[PDB]
Curated annotation (Swiss-Prot), chain A:
Record topology, Extracellular segments: 214-238, 282-283, 343-557, 613-640, 705-746
Location of this chain's protein in the cell: Cell membrane; Cell projection, Cilium; Endoplasmic reticulum; Golgi apparatus
Disease: Polycystic kidney disease 1 with or without polycystic liver disease: An autosomal dominant disorder characterized by renal cysts, liver cysts and intracranial aneurysm. Clinical variability is due to differences in the rate of loss of glomerular filtration, the age of reaching end-stage renal disease and the occurrence of hypertension, symptomatic extrarenal cysts, and subarachnoid hemorrhage from intracranial 'berry' aneurysm.
Effect of G261R: In PKD1; likely benign
Subunit structure comment from the entry: Component of the heterotetrameric polycystin channel complex with PKD2; the tetramer contains one PKD1 chain and three PKD2 chains. Interacts with PKD2; the interaction is required for ciliary localization. Interacts with PKD2L1. Interacts with PRKX; involved in differentiation and controlled morphogenesis of the kidney. Interacts (via extracellular domain) with WNT3A, WNT4, WNT5A and WNT9B. Interacts with DVL1 and DVL2. Interacts with NPHP1 (via SH3 domain). Interacts with BBS1, BBS4, BBS5 and TTC8. Interacts with RGS7.
Glycan attachment points: N394, N446, N501
Outcome of substituting A610P: In PKD1; uncertain significance
Effect on the protein upon substituting I95F: In PKD1; likely benign
Protein family according to the UniProt entry: Belongs to the polycystin family.
Membrane topology, Cytoplasmic segments: 36-192, 579-591, 662-683
UniProt protein name: Polycystin-1
Organism annotation: Homo sapiens
Whole sequence portion shown: 3061 to 4120 of 4303
Protein function: Component of a heteromeric calcium-permeable ion channel formed by PKD1 and PKD2 that is activated by interaction between PKD1 and a Wnt family member, such as WNT3A and WNT9B. Both PKD1 and PKD2 are required for channel activity. Involved in renal tubulogenesis. Involved in fluid-flow mechanosensation by the primary cilium in renal epithelium. Acts as a regulator of cilium length, together with PKD2. The dynamic control of cilium length is essential in the regulation of mechanotransductive signaling.
From Swiss-Prot, chain C:
Residues in the Cytoplasmic compartment per record: 114-129, 198-221
Variant or mutagenesis effect after changing C256R: In PKD2; Abolishes increased channel activity due to a gain of function mutation. Abolishes increased channel activity due to a gain of function mutation
Location of the protein in the cell: Cell projection, Cilium membrane; Endoplasmic reticulum membrane; Cell membrane; Basolateral cell membrane
Post-translational note: Phosphorylated. Phosphorylation is important for protein function; a mutant that lacks the N-terminal phosphorylation sites cannot complement a zebrafish pkd2-deficient mutant. PKD-mediated phosphorylation at the C-terminus regulates its function in the release of Ca(2+) stores from the endoplasmic reticulum.
Name of the protein this chain belongs to: Polycystin-2
Listed result of changing Y308A: Abolishes increased channel activity due to a gain of function mutation
Residues binding cholesterol, per UniProt: Q181
Reported effect, F228P: Gain-of-function mutation resulting in increased channel activity. Absence of gain of function. Increased channel activity
TM regions (residue ranges): 93-113, 130-150, 177-197, 222-243, 279-299
Tissue: Detected in fetal and adult kidney. Detected at the thick ascending limb of the loop of Henle, at distal tubules, including the distal convoluted tubule and cortical collecting tubules, with weak staining of the collecting duct. Detected on placenta syncytiotrophoblasts (at protein level). Strongly expressed in ovary, fetal and adult kidney, testis, and small intestine. Not detected in peripheral leukocytes.
Taxonomic path: Eukaryota, Metazoa, Chordata, Craniata, Vertebrata
Source organism: Homo sapiens
Residues of the full protein shown: 377 to 698 of 968
Amino acid sequence: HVRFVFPEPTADVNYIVMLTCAVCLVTYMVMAAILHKLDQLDASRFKYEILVKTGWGRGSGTTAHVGIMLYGVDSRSGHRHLDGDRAFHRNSLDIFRIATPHSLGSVWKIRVWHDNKGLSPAWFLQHVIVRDLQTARSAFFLVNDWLSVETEANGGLLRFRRLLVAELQRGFFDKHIWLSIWDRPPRSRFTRIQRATCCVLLICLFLGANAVWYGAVGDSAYSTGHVSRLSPLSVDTVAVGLVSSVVVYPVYLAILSLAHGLSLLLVAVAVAVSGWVGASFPPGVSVAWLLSSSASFLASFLGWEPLKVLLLAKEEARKVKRLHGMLRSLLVYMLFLLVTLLASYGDASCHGHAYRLQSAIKQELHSRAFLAITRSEELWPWMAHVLLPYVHGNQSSPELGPPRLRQVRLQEALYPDPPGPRVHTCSAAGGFSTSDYDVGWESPHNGSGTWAYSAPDLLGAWSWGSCAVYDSGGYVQELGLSLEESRDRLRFLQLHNWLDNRSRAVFLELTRYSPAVGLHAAVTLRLEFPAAGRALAALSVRPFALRRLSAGLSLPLLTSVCLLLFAVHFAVAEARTWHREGRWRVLRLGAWARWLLVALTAATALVRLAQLGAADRQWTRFVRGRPRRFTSFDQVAQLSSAARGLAASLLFLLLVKAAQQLRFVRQWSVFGKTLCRALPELLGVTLGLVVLGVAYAQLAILLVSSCVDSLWSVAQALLVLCPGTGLSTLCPAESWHLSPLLCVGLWALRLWGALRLGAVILRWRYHALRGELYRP
Amino acid sequence: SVLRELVTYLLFLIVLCILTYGMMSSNVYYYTRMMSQLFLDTPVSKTEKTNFKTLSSMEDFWKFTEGSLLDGLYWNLLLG
Amino acid sequence: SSHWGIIATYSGAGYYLDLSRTREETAAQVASLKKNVWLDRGTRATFIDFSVYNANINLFCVVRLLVEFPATGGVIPSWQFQPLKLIRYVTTFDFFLAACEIIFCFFIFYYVVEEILEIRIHKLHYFRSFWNCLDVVIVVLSVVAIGINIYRTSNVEVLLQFLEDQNTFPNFEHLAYWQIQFNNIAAVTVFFVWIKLFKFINFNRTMSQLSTTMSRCAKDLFGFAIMFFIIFLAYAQLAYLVFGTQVDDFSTFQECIFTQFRIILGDINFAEIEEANRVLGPIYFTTFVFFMFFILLNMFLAIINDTYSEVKSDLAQQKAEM
Amino acid sequence: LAYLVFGTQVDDFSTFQECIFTQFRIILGDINFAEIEEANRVLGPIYFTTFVFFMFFILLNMFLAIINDTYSEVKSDLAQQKAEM
Amino acid sequence: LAYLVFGTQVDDFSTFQECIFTQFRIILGDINFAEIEEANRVLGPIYFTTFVFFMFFILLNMFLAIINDTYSEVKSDLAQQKAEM
Ligand SMILES: CCCCCCCC(=O)OC[C@H](COP(=O)([O-])O)OC(=O)CCCCCCC
Ligand SMILES: [Ca+2]
């Protein structure tokens, strides 16, 4: 058979296709804009700077020009129709310079073509007298040889070896559409935007063809998923890329003004179809699609375009080279941005589902009640009332492994409840027990008792807590017996006084698994008791997707390896420009920007790979025995989080960089310059503001010290001026010692009128920069 | 000349910024607020949901003076 | 019809009951529904619908209550109370309003014919004014509102069918939906009509000065607003990726945008953002505040101040010198 | 616009003068926005974001620009007519 | 004016010092406006709106105007009379 089965059976959206087509369209929208300026700007050494006088023959009166063609390594030039004074008089010499930037070499390759304005010139022009002036790409060797009518005398510095071999050097970098957008010679009708539009359309319909193959014509036996391997087998990816190229390639030659808008409509409908059929894609059929598209592009760049070639007065050349560098920088930045976007925003649906899942888990675990804790011995009714029904209840709770308990003993008891006021935060801090024990209490009578040591492992350390920071170990109580004896075990532990006295925290944590959304979650609760009696509470739910290395070549692995290669490329490019100017490359962005970008790029990939390894290790450890151990996935959930943040940070930088690239528009270049020149003034203003703020803050903190709660007008006029929200509402609870950085932001929001002082400075600077870019 | 003034000012400031440390780091605020919660907001009795901060009648004052006040004064206390 | 709830867009099918007119019978029905388990792990959404009249002021009220059960567990409730007027012509003021509506239709016809009389041959470009664009958007919104009103009030057959027998369920959801749509369209139209008043306030040399300043400033204001929005969205995506799974204020991208706009007003709650990430939490907040109030708010001032001064200088050098 | 959109749901926009006072209090950051966003999911936040942007980043700066230019011109021409004659 | 209008009702304007401090806190965004409107339905909102408008858009901008003009003049005289030899 049928072969066009109706797509779109569901409503979910795939972000990979949308992101990649958006990138591929934005890069074209910027490349066309720069290329228009490049084309409008240029719409106007092969030889030496010596004379080219030729007077060895007469009878050559005809107003015509001559052509000196010098080939080489990516260097070529045509003729030179200059404006001289001789004007090709009766038996006169035509000697003049030329604006030919062809950087040829001193090889035996130079062609001299003598035209004829009507009658042929009978004069014998030996050569141009020049030995070495600028580049010395040829030598002054006499030829004086006649050729056909307006033909060229082939020489050094009509067999089949010279009929079309000239095209092998002419159109080698001109007909090859990819490496020709910045290598087009003048006098050609390509406008330098046509060769960009056609190739953009070309890659667009490679993407569309691959998407439509993967989405609509899988009827082989369905050709994918069931019998397909995500890892490339040189058939699942390369073979389809080649056939997708061949089946739709001829329209490129067919399309190769008004015929050009239909190109935009064709690319629009192609991306629309790719997005429409792109919705119903499993995670593998998307990375496979990406690899097939990349393979098709690589095939069209190496083995097809090369096989279609068979059938004031000195500074105007700096701009073209600058723009040529700009194109390479633009392509590199687009590729890097696409890689980062795929690394960070490949699982947005999982992001929303994870938020919902963690919210649901907290609200069905009676988080309000757990944080409404009053002491350290009523948690047993808590467990018997809300925990065991939640775990062993015949309801929606796929646990994936039995729970666990890991308390502390501290090897020393604690005093009784404090009459009146209790400990401030974490008073009476001693040691931590690490020895063996026996049943009932810590007293080994015959040997290894039930209360084993349960030594810490090497995973998911700590949890910077209220009293101290444990890492992995404690009193490991399995609390198993899923069917009915879990309550019996809890009652036996309570009756035998397992952790009655000398118990800091509880540290209860098991697991979660949402079969529908496809994301797992690690729940970890703790009931750290600072004093005997009243206790605190702190729970954390981390949702994450368990993806492992042994799954093949999933998207995170591909993005990680691409990020690693980008990092190493940046590192070598920075080391070259570091060693080339030796030392003292300081007081600049320079190293302190490139090295930090390299650090972020490497760290992102390294943390993602570490997370992938840890997930696989923990999963293969869990399959060993299910009703035997716990395996504590809690470490993996941390790593993923870190990885995510790193990627986000990277993307942030890239976006900021995009802003500073808007200075390429002439009128928009001021904004970047102003902020660059006002930095010393702004830094001085901030220094003055922070000194004044420190003085006032010390005055305020040292001023009251009384707790009078009355209108002490003399003392009040200073303290209670912005204290209605500052004294105890801004951040006096615990942020003064937990997050000192947040306090300055909170007090800069309140007093945001002072920050208007910058308007005094920036304005002036801006005005100055509009007096030096308009009048002069 | 300016360098001497600078160094003597930094010395006079480094001595002063640590002399004030011993005034604000004595945890007097903790004791004062502990006493404030001990004497102010504790209810007069378990059968009345009122405290000294929300007194409204003379009978409330008579309840307070035989109640939370005596408990706070009678249970490092009672200078004279 | 579809609903567009919070998690998804639910269809208009499912398993339904019409309850009774008496407390006892409805209580028995819901007890029977609860006994033979009706809501189980497969349940995804539940709706309750009814309406009231209140003859004192002639105004119906349509009530809908929705409860969503996401696959990840939990419950999400939402509600909707919508008043309607379906018996318009009862008093003289209603006839006055009808006459005013007819006058509005005549005014819209006059404006559109005046528009087409001019766009035909006179000034074929016509789009380099920004007042013509406002006029065309105004008439488009007005004709859309008129079409919605005609399509909505022309059929009230649900009310007529309900008036036959009154022991059935009156279905007024489409009427409420179209009332909300009409209200939105009319509010936007009124806003733009009121904005259009700037076309006539140039009665002295101060109004023209300010209008010229704004017109000459719009271009580079756009030029810098591009950068401002790029940086704004760069902060928003970072907040979404870092805090979007724990804070409920950054749970969705548009919610991140709204929270960032609320931070400028000073309506921030730090008590939840701070513990979502001990590092990168305070950093984001402080850098956002500094670079939003100390830097980007002041470049707008620089630009506006420069263009206003230049306009005044040109207007004072041209004058008193000729 | 706010009166027509939220006039029957929020209670800070019940009457026109209430809308004016609420708009004056938005500038100082004294509203909920939890009830504005739920009363109308689209066109509710659009109003809020556009209002905040246009009030803070445009009109306040125009007020200060006018004041700065006038003060500079007054000081300049009083320094011109005086101390130069 | 606030003391004479809201003196016997609001408890934030019960004494003159409280009136001054309440106005200072209003500038910094500590508005209540509930009992302000309850106490006097007209001339209560009028006071609030006029105070907010004048203190937010006009009066606090003149300090910045003075500072801006002084900075411009200082920079001009320091960069023009110097930096020329
Ligand atoms: C001795 C140094 C003098 C510093 C001059 C400060 C000028 C100033 O604050 O400008 C007013 C400011 C922003 O402008 P506005 O629109 O609110 O009037 O709005 C505000 O002021 C509200 C914030 C509270 C100001 C606290 C004063 C530091
Ligand atoms: Ca018009």
